[PDB]
Design a protein around this ligand. Structure first.
Ligand SMILES: O=C(O)C[C@H]1C[C@H](CNC(=O)c2cc3ccsc3cn2)C1
Length: 167
């Protein structure tokens, strides 16, 4: 038993809700919140900009130190940093950005990072400003992630669509 509420169960291990991932994080304090990161950990917009703002920019400060020490992530890769006031940990995961021409097949590699964590609150990778089809992203998520994933979908319209087109 865990503290997640109002989720619709999609599969054995995937759950989905219409929700702002920022507010869901502040209420659940999950062990892991996933950020829709880029390779530079520059949290300007989308989910990343919203999560970072909710940390009063502490996420960005920590991220800049990480990059200065380690260099950029790989597309499809991840790193674990602090969750600040939102979670114990933030798993920064880089899905391919279609608006940068990145290979959508790397989306499966990106979701594989979730398997290193038993439970996660997460957005749909490569959705929103990353330009991929959220329905596709959901299919890859269901077919790749084996751990328990609680997906927060900000847009109510998108959500209802994802649900009603789900197989
Ligand atoms: O437009 C569509 O069809 C769907 C797109 C994908 C979804 C991306 N979500 C975000 O950027 C996001 C923004 C913010 C802002 C404050 S909290 C928050 C959570 N998330 C909207």
């Amino acid at each position: 038993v865990n503290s997640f509420s109002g989720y619709l169960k999609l599969t054995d291990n995937v759950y989905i809700k219409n929700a702002d991932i920022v507010e869901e994080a502040k209420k659940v304090k999950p062990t892991v919140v996933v950020n829709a990161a880029n390779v530079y950990l520059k949290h300007g917009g989308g989910v990343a900009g919203a999560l970072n703002k909710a940390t009063n920019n502490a996420m960005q400060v920590e991220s800049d130190d990480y990059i200065a020490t380690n260099g950029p992530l790989k597309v499809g890769g991840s790193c674990v940093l602090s969750g600040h006031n939102l979670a114990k940990h933030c798993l920064h995961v880089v899905g391919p950005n279609v608006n940068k021409g990145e290979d959508i097949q790397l989306l499966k590699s990106a979701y594989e990072n979730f398997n290193q964590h038993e439970v996660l609150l997460a957005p749909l990778l490569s959705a929103g400003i990353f330009g991929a089809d959220p329905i596709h992203s959901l299919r890859v998520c269901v077919d790749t992630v084996r751990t328990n994933v609680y997906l927060a979908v900000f847009d109510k319209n998108l959500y209802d669509k994802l649900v009603s087109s789900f197989l």
